[PDB]
């Protein structure tokens, strides 16, 4: 085996933060040197272990997610950080082992200004847990007085979208973000190279 990060990164279409994805990769090898040293990715932030020892250190099964996030709120991907996309879109376990990689790619999705193909949910009951999504596109209950069940006032439609102008200020370019989470089970380790 050779572990397909080319069929991860060189994909063309990415999801949105309300409908972020998963994919599990197993029985492959570790070749993170090209990811480190290609220098086409601006960000390589993570905690715990140091990248100089992940070409031998390995686990039993790894996971990956691929979707685009606002660049003015990149600190909101952390174990225990406040915010709103750190509230209703993607959570992380507190004792964190995996690693997050990001970069700026405002050339392919630098479309005509005001384009809002990618959305984000603003209002949801209470809190989040890691490792589950929200496909409930239903209109949420702000209605202490029950308005309709259909959208009205005293009640809101919480699914607002982004904006991608090729001359925006600094925080609205579409930075793609991936996370490669490490987790350990009873099974023997499988995913590493030399």
């Amino acid at each position: 085996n050779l572990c397909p990060f080319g069929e991860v990164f060189n994909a063309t279409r990415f999801a949105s933060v309300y409908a972020w994805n998963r994919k599990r990769i197993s029985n492959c090898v570790a070749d993170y040197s090209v990811l480190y040293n290609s220098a086409s990715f601006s960000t390589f932030k993570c905690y715990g272990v140091s990248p100089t020892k992940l070409n031998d250190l390995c686990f039993t099964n790894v996971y990956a997610d691929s979707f685009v996030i606002r660049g003015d709120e990149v600190r909101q991907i952390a174990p225990g950080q406040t915010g709103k996309i750190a509230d209703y879109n993607y959570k992380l376990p507190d004792d964190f082992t995996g690693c997050v990689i990001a970069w700026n790619s405002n050339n392919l999705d630098s479309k005509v200004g005001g384009n809002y193909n990618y959305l984000y949910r603003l209002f949801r009951k209470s809190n989040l847990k890691p490792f589950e999504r929200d496909i409930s596109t239903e209109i949420y209950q702000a209605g202490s007085t029950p308005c309709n069940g259909v959208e009205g006032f005293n009640c809101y439609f919480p699914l607002q979208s982004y904006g991608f102008q090729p001359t925006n200020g600094v925080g609205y370019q579409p930075y793609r973000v991936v996370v490669l989470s490490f987790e350990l089970l009873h099974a023997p380790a499988t995913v590493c190279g030399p």
Epitope: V112, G114, N115, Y116, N117, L119, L122, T137, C147, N148, V150, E151, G152, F153, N154, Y156, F157, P158, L159, Q160, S161
Partner: antibody, heavy 116, light 108 residues
Framework: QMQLVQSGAEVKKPGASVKVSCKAS????????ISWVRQAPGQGLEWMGR???????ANYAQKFQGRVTITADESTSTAYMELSSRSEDTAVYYC????????????????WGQGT | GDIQLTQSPSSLSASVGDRVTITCRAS??????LNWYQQKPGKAPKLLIY???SLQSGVPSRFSGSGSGTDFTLTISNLQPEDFATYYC?????????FGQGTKVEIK
């Protein structure tokens, strides 16, 4: 820059199916949350429901609870309203528009049909 | 559940440069969201005033609109023959979308 075609006049017997076209061209698409509005000759307007091509979430009013259907297509960029009902509901076929913003106004703003 | 909408008075008789005000009413505390429309026979009802308190681009400062709570007022100064058509109320507090019964102004 934008218009929706006018379907020809027809006389339908009760129980017959009805096909209508509402072209959504021009500007940036997926901008307005498409709806539909009916009226009778000599009577006021009435509202039925809402369609968004991004999600397709159903909306239906009281006089058409589970009776009339809402379908659409992004690629052809056309709204579709089909019904199997009587002949006393025939009139001009106005297809509504208007952007349902989030945290802002949700009015049917402009850009409707000039006819059937 | 469903709001009821009314428009008063039903028919208005007017001449050049008169004063007319639409008395619209409902049965709920409509905070800000209401719209008005103009209907000549042969078209879709074009916008006159959006949000009941704001002026839409493409409409001059001839038309005016305000109001909050339950009672709303509509103002046109120096009326013109192209303004002589049927009016409409349009609240947007909640659903279903209710509509006015129509108000026709015709020249003496």
């Amino acid at each position: 820059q934008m218009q929706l075609v006018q379907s020809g006049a027809e006389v339908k017997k009760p129980g017959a199916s009805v096909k209508v076209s509402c072209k959504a061209s021009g500007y940036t698409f997926t901008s307005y949350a498409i709806s539909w509005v009916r009226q009778a000759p000599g009577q006021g307007l009435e509202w039925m429901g809402r369609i968004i091509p991004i999600l397709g979430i159903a909306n239906y009013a009281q006089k058409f609870q589970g009776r009339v259907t809402i379908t659409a297509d992004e690629s052809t960029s056309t709204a579709y309203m089909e019904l199997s009902s009587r002949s006393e509901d025939t009139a001009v076929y106005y297809c509504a528009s208007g952007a349902f913003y989030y945290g802002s106004g949700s009015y049917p703003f402009d850009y409707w049909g000039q006819g059937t | 559940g469903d709001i009821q909408l009314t428009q008063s008075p039903s028919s208005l008789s007017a001449s050049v440069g008169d004063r007319v005000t639409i008395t619209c009413r409902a049965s709920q505390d409509i905070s800000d969201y209401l719209n008005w429309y103009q209907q000549k026979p042969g078209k879709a009802p074009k916008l006159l005033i959006y949000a009941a308190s704001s002026l839409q681009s493409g409409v001059p400062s001839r038309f005016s609109g305000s109001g909050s709570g339950t009672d709303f007022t509509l103002t046109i100064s120096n009326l013109q023959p192209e303004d002589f058509a049927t009016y409409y109320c349009q609240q947007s507090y909640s659903a279903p979308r209710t509509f006015g019964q129509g108000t026709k102004v015709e020249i003496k």
